[PDB]
Amino acid sequence: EPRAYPFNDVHGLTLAGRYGELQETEPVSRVRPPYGEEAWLVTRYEDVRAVLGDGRFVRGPSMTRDEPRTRPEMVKGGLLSMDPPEHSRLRRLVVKAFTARRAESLRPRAREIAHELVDQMAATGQPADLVAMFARQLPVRVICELLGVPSADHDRFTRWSGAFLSTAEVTAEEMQEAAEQAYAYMGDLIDRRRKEPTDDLVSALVQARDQQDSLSEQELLDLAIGLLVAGYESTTTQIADFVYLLMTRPELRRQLLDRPELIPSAVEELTRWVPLGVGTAFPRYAVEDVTLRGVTIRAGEPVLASTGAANRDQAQFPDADRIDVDRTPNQHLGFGHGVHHCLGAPLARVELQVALEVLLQRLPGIRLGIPETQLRWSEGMLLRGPLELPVVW
Ligand SMILES: CC[C@H]1OC(=O)/C=C/[C@H](C)[C@@H](O[C@@H]2O[C@H](C)C[C@H](N(C)C)[C@H]2O)[C@@H](C)C[C@@H](C)C(=O)/C=C/C=C/[C@@H]1CO[C@@H]1O[C@H](C)[C@@H](O)[C@@H](O)[C@H]1OC
Ligand code: HEM
């Protein structure tokens, strides 16, 4: 009786047709994911937004429940497994240090790093793999700059970080070594910034105060490693997907070459359009019985809120399947919604904008070097995107 879930095919970015069918005829339905409990699935924009925004839907049961999910292993802990008021305290302290101003201040360095990456990619000759050489490098290097990791240490910190990618081919113990190296390095960097503060985010986290209160040593460390992992693969995947779309849809590339000022609005539109998750936002758990479009979701039950389907709801976005780089309004849920809305989003925006700006400026003819039908897609099962993107220009 519940439908097998996910509906999305991982071998591309297509939004499964089942979502549109369900938005019309069964907007709140039952699904059986590959691992974890059967769950409610919500697909309309209004209902996804309601689930992500409602006080009655919590994340804390993620710590113990067999969470409906797409892989055998779990992704749990950190802010995304917390609820108000504990979540609220940690969040206030972080955003006091990790501001929209600080994200914007990283644009000039993000551009320098992007141009160095294009230098290095171009120098390996054509075709070159945009994923390994650019998409997998820019976000982790930008997080190193954000945090305050010295330049000299970016290559090794990058190597450690790559072990946390859901596409990494590494053993339980190799992941273990990598995490221990990253955590020991970050613990020492925190200790150095406490003694001698600088202008970077670790120093600003150490100095953050809210209602007389501050981040403990353990919270500082968990937050720094958490921001790295939350901000690396996501951004890397989204860069690869946006450039894949630019290379395969000529009008999109043309419009951004002719009007580079449309880049920030294009980043919003691509974030709305690309159904980046294989499945949904992380499951929310009813704290009491909730009626949604006539269906009773009982206290304790999990709900999968598809921001992928939501952002393609024809009731919210006129001609929702068209990519219109100048779409206004554009209140998409691609960075989430409610108290857990992406805290890295101002920085993700700078990076995605910088990625398109620099690739288009330096390589206006960038295009696939193999037929599109021959691209190899990630089977990490969390996010969708190409494993390799051989490009020519
Ligand atoms: C908040 C910090 C936390 O941040 C996340 O929980 C991020 C989750 C992202 C939102 C996720 O994306 C969403 O997925 C959906 C399937 C689709 C969504 N969408 C397109 C709508 C997409 O937005 C995930 C899957 C992104 C990928 C790259 C990932 O696995 C990140 C893990 C980060 C964990 C870190 C926590 O770190 C762990 O902290 C605990 C405390 C440590 O002891 C240690 O263990 C450390 O260990 C890495
Ligand atoms: C394009 C890249 C990114 C996308 C698409 C993205 C998307 C998301 C979404 C949809 C959520 C909400 C998840 C949910 O409610 O289930 C989220 C949360 C979060 N994101 Fe991002 N993100 C990206 C980049 C980043 C970056 C660059 C950082 C840090 C530098 C970051 C840090 C976080 C953190 C810490 C959370 C949890 C916030 C909380 O629970 O209060 N993200 N992200």
Curated annotation (Swiss-Prot):
Pfam families per UniProt: p450
Binding site for substrate: G77
Pathway membership: Antibiotic biosynthesis; mycinamicin biosynthesis
SUPFAM superfamilies: Cytochrome P450
Gene3D superfamilies: Cytochrome P450
Biased composition (Basic and acidic residues): 64-74
UniProt KW keywords: Antibiotic biosynthesis, Heme, Iron, Metal-binding, Monooxygenase, NADP, Oxidoreductase
The protein's name: Mycinamicin IV hydroxylase/epoxidase
Native source species: Micromonospora griseorubida
Upper lineage: Bacteria, Bacillati, Actinomycetota, Actinomycetes, Micromonosporales
